[PDB]
Enzyme design. Structure first.
Site, PDB file in Angstrom:
ATOM      1  N   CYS A  55       0.870  -1.062   0.076  1.00 38.26           N
ATOM      2  CA  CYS A  55      -0.060  -0.079   0.105  1.00 38.26           C
ATOM      3  C   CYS A  55       0.822   1.219  -0.114  1.00 38.26           C
ATOM      4  O   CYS A  55       0.580   2.245  -0.768  1.00 38.26           O
ATOM      5  CB  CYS A  55      -0.624   0.256   1.225  1.00 38.26           C
ATOM      6  SG  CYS A  55      -1.416   1.914   1.388  1.00 38.26           S
ATOM      7  N   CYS A  71      -1.136   2.181  -3.184  1.00 35.63           N
ATOM      8  CA  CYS A  71      -2.127   3.057  -3.086  1.00 35.63           C
ATOM      9  C   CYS A  71      -1.252   4.516  -2.910  1.00 35.63           C
ATOM     10  O   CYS A  71      -1.640   5.357  -3.635  1.00 35.63           O
ATOM     11  CB  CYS A  71      -2.731   2.859  -1.750  1.00 35.63           C
ATOM     12  SG  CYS A  71      -3.277   1.115  -1.520  1.00 35.63           S
ATOM     13  N   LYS A 131       0.793   5.681  -5.912  1.00 40.02           N
ATOM     14  CA  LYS A 131       0.030   5.751  -7.135  1.00 40.02           C
ATOM     15  C   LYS A 131      -0.882   7.143  -6.994  1.00 40.02           C
ATOM     16  O   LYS A 131      -0.720   7.886  -8.227  1.00 40.02           O
ATOM     17  CB  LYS A 131      -0.852   4.559  -7.055  1.00 40.02           C
ATOM     18  CG  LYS A 131      -1.972   4.393  -8.088  1.00 40.02           C
ATOM     19  CD  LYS A 131      -3.355   5.266  -7.939  1.00 40.02           C
ATOM     20  CE  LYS A 131      -4.081   4.662  -6.848  1.00 40.02           C
ATOM     21  NZ  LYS A 131      -4.798   3.418  -7.058  1.00 40.02           N
ATOM     22  N   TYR A 186      -7.942  -2.697 -13.068  1.00 42.01           N
ATOM     23  CA  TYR A 186      -7.852  -1.301 -12.762  1.00 42.01           C
ATOM     24  C   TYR A 186      -6.224  -0.811 -12.744  1.00 42.01           C
ATOM     25  O   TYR A 186      -5.977   0.208 -13.167  1.00 42.01           O
ATOM     26  CB  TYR A 186      -8.429  -1.040 -11.271  1.00 42.01           C
ATOM     27  CG  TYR A 186      -7.677  -1.298 -10.187  1.00 42.01           C
ATOM     28  CD1 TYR A 186      -7.438  -2.749  -9.679  1.00 42.01           C
ATOM     29  CD2 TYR A 186      -6.750  -0.619  -9.369  1.00 42.01           C
ATOM     30  CE1 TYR A 186      -6.710  -2.885  -8.610  1.00 42.01           C
ATOM     31  CE2 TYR A 186      -6.001  -0.844  -8.440  1.00 42.01           C
ATOM     32  CZ  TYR A 186      -6.099  -2.255  -7.705  1.00 42.01           C
ATOM     33  OH  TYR A 186      -5.024  -2.285  -6.926  1.00 42.01           O
ATOM     34  N   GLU A 209      -4.997   2.473 -14.563  1.00 43.92           N
ATOM     35  CA  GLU A 209      -4.449   3.454 -13.905  1.00 43.92           C
ATOM     36  C   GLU A 209      -3.084   3.871 -14.483  1.00 43.92           C
ATOM     37  O   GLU A 209      -2.787   5.116 -14.741  1.00 43.92           O
ATOM     38  CB  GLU A 209      -4.528   3.384 -12.347  1.00 43.92           C
ATOM     39  CG  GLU A 209      -5.830   3.225 -11.527  1.00 43.92           C
ATOM     40  CD  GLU A 209      -5.898   3.247 -10.222  1.00 43.92           C
ATOM     41  OE1 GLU A 209      -4.407   2.563  -9.879  1.00 43.92           O
ATOM     42  OE2 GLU A 209      -6.668   2.939  -9.547  1.00 43.92           O
ATOM     43  N   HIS A 212     -26.364  22.088  -4.760  1.00 45.99           N
ATOM     44  CA  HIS A 212     -26.247  22.714  -6.135  1.00 45.99           C
ATOM     45  C   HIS A 212     -25.239  23.922  -5.762  1.00 45.99           C
ATOM     46  O   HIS A 212     -25.192  24.623  -4.842  1.00 45.99           O
ATOM     47  CB  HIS A 212     -27.411  23.315  -6.294  1.00 45.99           C
ATOM     48  CG  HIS A 212     -27.829  23.886  -7.751  1.00 45.99           C
ATOM     49  ND1 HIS A 212     -27.560  23.003  -8.986  1.00 45.99           N
ATOM     50  CD2 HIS A 212     -28.241  25.292  -8.036  1.00 45.99           C
ATOM     51  CE1 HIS A 212     -27.549  23.980  -9.886  1.00 45.99           C
ATOM     52  NE2 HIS A 212     -27.934  24.994  -9.343  1.00 45.99           N
ATOM     53  N   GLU A 270     -25.321  15.971  -6.794  1.00 45.81           N
ATOM     54  CA  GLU A 270     -26.693  16.246  -6.846  1.00 45.81           C
ATOM     55  C   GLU A 270     -27.542  15.440  -7.795  1.00 45.81           C
ATOM     56  O   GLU A 270     -28.733  15.196  -7.685  1.00 45.81           O
ATOM     57  CB  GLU A 270     -27.090  17.747  -6.845  1.00 45.81           C
ATOM     58  CG  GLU A 270     -26.870  18.382  -8.273  1.00 45.81           C
ATOM     59  CD  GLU A 270     -27.627  19.822  -8.077  1.00 45.81           C
ATOM     60  OE1 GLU A 270     -28.237  20.107  -7.612  1.00 45.81           O
ATOM     61  OE2 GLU A 270     -26.646  20.491  -8.672  1.00 45.81           O
TER      62      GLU A 270
END
Ligand SMILES: Cc1cc2nc3c(=O)[nH]c(=O)nc-3n(C[C@H](O)[C@H](O)[C@H](O)COP(=O)(O)OP(=O)(O)OC[C@H]3O[C@@H](n4cnc5c(N)ncnc54)[C@H](O)[C@@H]3O)c2cc1C
Ligand SMILES: Cc1cc2nc3c(=O)[nH]c(=O)nc-3n(C[C@H](O)[C@H](O)[C@H](O)COP(=O)(O)OP(=O)(O)OC[C@H]3O[C@@H](n4cnc5c(N)ncnc54)[C@H](O)[C@@H]3O)c2cc1C
EC number: 1.8.1.7
Lengths: 461, 461
Positions: free
Chosen positions: A41, A46, A49, A180, A184, A450, A455
């Site tokens: 990690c 993680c 990266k 992934y 990435e 908003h 939203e």
């Protein structure tokens, strides 16, 4: 033979989290680590990266500078600058983790652990023996590479580990894989200026994600200048006078196969899978069950088939994420040292973010999975596709796609899938809502914020 | 006298939302609008503000360019470029809204409405009369300005409306007020290069937000180069040879008052409040109740004191937000045309985002409010403060602060307050969770998304 309450093999996410919680609970614990604390990690996953992603994100935003009223920004990205800063930051983290262990009174045993022949489960590290009534194996995994026997010259390519060792931006890069990590890496290399190709065996990336996401993600890559080589695979790699030359076979269905040479390749990056780190553990001395890839098999409570031996995290081969290893490691400590027998991690509804451009957020079932679980008649989806307001004034465009998967009459929210600017930070609270069993009325009854992208998820019709 | 099922006075957020839903329900509706459709929100509020914020955000990110390995970006922001693009985008929206009305078969009556002397509630627009058994007043509000009688020369200053008319970036700007609009404008002007001062009557901005937020927000402004003039107010304004000269009184408690002249001011922006637009409606002909500021008084169902007369949105003076006006307008249409008598908007747990730098997100009770509602003994808060990973490699720094307010033994989540990068997109789903009555265990039991800022909210201890 030194005895402890808890012996944790591997000082990465899962191993440290479990050791720390156990120690809070009064356990006398020790962590065996053969390399750097923080494990994947912090060192090669993680963290480094994310830093590289933030960097790639700067590159894209700089393309919009002139559109925003500023003067054009002119240039060349300097890889070594950021690389040096990234390494330093990793160095800072390693020192913190070490300190965390010390403050907790956890003993760090430095070296490579292996089980012994001994009856009561016992490990050996550097000639010394160690034992505990509860031993956690949390040795993680590693990048998978092809055998020279199947793909000659494969060893000329690097893995995600090697990516973090690079000191210059490769001029021409080819990434092999469609998961992934592949996505990435392709996105970072491309945004920073490498002429990048992504070679996938089918027609889309992220084929295990909801199909709206695999389709959208494949298009976004192409739109960002990544060449996606479909139905292609590497046949051989060779070291030419100036870089590598990649021989590939493209086999589009309904067509004849065609062989192509890719010349002048600087970087060949294999992002084809991960293999568990169990090979040198001497598991067989205890008869601990593994599958045929080398994963340790565990039950819902992380138990192996041997009493007082557990496994968590990547080594188990399920839900290969930093937070899962942590949560499973923690729940396990509560079960063992707090006597909470029902303490275990629920592997459903674990949210994931893929750091693509724009990022992807997913939680829960894909539309197909819900269809198989509840039946077509019982599944209803809602979706939207729009251009975020950020691009109202830019020539460059990205899209935002969102999809909500509901089940039964009540329209329980069983899946949320999205790709778009801000989706990396947007997912967490919806993941909380999904975990609580929200229905669509619960979303609809929450007043929107908003103007935001978020939203849109509360105003789907 | 033309008769309709529903007559809506004001074509802004609340008025359009209500008219559209009513029409879906079979109502024959007409919308009276004296200016531009879209009302505040599209023309001089939400939308143009967000575009200017995205622009200011570009300015800050450009400060970090060199830190990220790129070459320094050199210059001058060109206000007119973005201004022209922003106006165009507003023009695009006005055309869409008009089309939305037409597709819905809603009649648009152009002009200024006023009630008549007539017995059955009737309005007049341009000499013609119009009536309906249900009439919605949704006329919104306007910026408040000081009277020349109290502050001589006040009319030399502009309001947020005037801000959207500016064609050049003012060199020196002074903003008066301490609410969200004041904060937002100060942050935009400053980031874009105006030498900006923010003049507040006390020591902090956003004094109605949770105190962690008002404190943090005040510091972030100072750190970003905004001069916050505390305990200060304007005494007089005068037009000098080259700009304006602002006379102010600073009265720090425990100190003698001191008068200061602020010279060479290009832009004086009053951001002191909003006043309801009810003055020219002839409300008194129907005896419709208002408070002493001119707000229309309504009950929980948006009823006024007169049968068949309702009011929603800014004109009512509560929760002055685009989405509230919309939600209240929609619930009202369901109540009137779908016969859902219990149909009304819950004004609790309405989330808000303040577009400061970094942005602020809040939902539910502040710590003080929870303390008054449940009692000190029954309130527990959790909080964190950290530097987002984005700044691991930058010289410039911003902080992220988060606070969770829990109540009772169960630790129900009754308030979430945060400020930090990404908090604008992070809030929506937690707002869903809060609305559903989540407790802290619900958060804690949601697996984190790493590496993100959002994950901090699910790992508070
Ligand atoms: C490029 C990349 C990017 C990723 N990005 C993300 C992301 O953004 N988000 C996310 O959630 N996940 C991400 N992941 C996945 C995540 O990093 C892993 O799931 C997580 O690190 C697994 O933790 P673990 O505790 O199982 O093992 P690891 O952290 O690998 O720790 C295992 C440790 O055991 C040590 N060890 C192994 N065998 C022995 C032995 N016999 N004796 C002593 N020590 C031993 C190893 O040295 C290591 O330190 C990424 C992974 C990679 C490779
Ligand atoms: C600078 C600024 C920034 C803001 N930023 C945000 C934000 O980011 N997020 C957010 O949620 N809210 C924000 N707000 C608040 C939000 O814009 C308002 O709450 C919302 O627009 C109110 O809608 P409304 O329907 O009540 O009225 P409005 O949209 O003002 O509509 C009233 C309409 O009635 C018309 N009218 C008035 N009287 C008459 C009459 N007699 N006859 C005919 N027509 C008439 C007016 O011309 C207007 O078009 C902001 C406001 C401002 C000023």
């Amino acid at each position: 033979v030194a005895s402890y309450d808890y012996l944790v093999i591997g000082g990465g996410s899962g191993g440290l989290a479990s050791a720390r919680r156990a120690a809070e609970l009064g356990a006398r614990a020790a962590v065996v680590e053969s390399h750097k604390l923080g494990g994947t990690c912090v060192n090669v996953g993680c963290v480094p990266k994310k830093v590289m992603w933030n960097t790639a994100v700067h590159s894209e935003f700089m393309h919009d500078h002139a559109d925003y009223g500023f003067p054009s920004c002119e240039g060349k990205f300097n890889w070594r600058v950021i690389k040096e800063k990234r390494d330093a930051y990793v160095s800072r983290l390693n020192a913190i983790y070490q300190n965390n262990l010390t403050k907790s009174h956890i003993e760090i045993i430095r070296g490579h652990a292996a089980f012994t022949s001994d009856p009561k489960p016992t490990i050996e590290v550097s000639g010394k023996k160690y034992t505990a009534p509860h031993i956690l194996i949390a040795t993680g995994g590693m990048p998978s590479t092809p055998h020279e026997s199947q793909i000659p010259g494969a060893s000329l390519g690097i893995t995600s580990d090697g990516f973090f060792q690079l000191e210059e931006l490769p001029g021409r890069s080819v990434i092999v894989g469609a998961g992934y990590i592949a996505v990435e890496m392709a996105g970072i290399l491309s945004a920073l200026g490498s002429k990048t190709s992504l070679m996938i065996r089918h027609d889309k990336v992220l084929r295990s994600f909801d199909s709206m996401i695999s389709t959208n993600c494949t298009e976004e890559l192409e739109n960002a200048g990544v060449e996606v080589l479909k139905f292609s695979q590497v046949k051989e790699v060779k070291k030419t006078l100036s870089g590598l030359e990649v021989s590939m076979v493209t086999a589009v269905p309904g067509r004849l196969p065609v062989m192509t040479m890719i010349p002048d390749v600087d970087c060949l990056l294999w992002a084809i899978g991960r293999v568990p780190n169990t090979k040198d553990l001497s598991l067989n001395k205890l008869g601990i069950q593994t599958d045929d890839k080398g994963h340790i098999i565990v039950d819902e409570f992380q138990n192996t088939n041997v009493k007082g031996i557990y496994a968590v995290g990547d080594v188990c081969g399920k839900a290969l994420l930093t937070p899962v290893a942590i949560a499973a490691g923690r729940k396990l400590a509560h079960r063992l040292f707090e006597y909470k027998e029902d303490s275990k991690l629920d592997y459903n509804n674990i949210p994931t973010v893929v750091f693509s451009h724009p990022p992807i957020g997913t939680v829960g079932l894909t539309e197909d999975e819900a269809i198989h679980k509840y039946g077509i008649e019982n599944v209803k989806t809602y979706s939207t596709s729009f251009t975020p307001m950020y691009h109202a004034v830019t020539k460059r465009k990205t899209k935002c796609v969102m999809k909500m998967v509901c089940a039964n009459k009540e329209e329980k929210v069983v899946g949320i899938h999205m790709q778009g600017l801000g989706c990396d930070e947007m997912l967490q609270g919806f993941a909380v809502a999904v975990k609580m069993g929200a229905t669509k009325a619960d979303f609809d009854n929450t007043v929107a914020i908003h103007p935001t992208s978020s939203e849109e998820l509360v105003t789907l019709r």
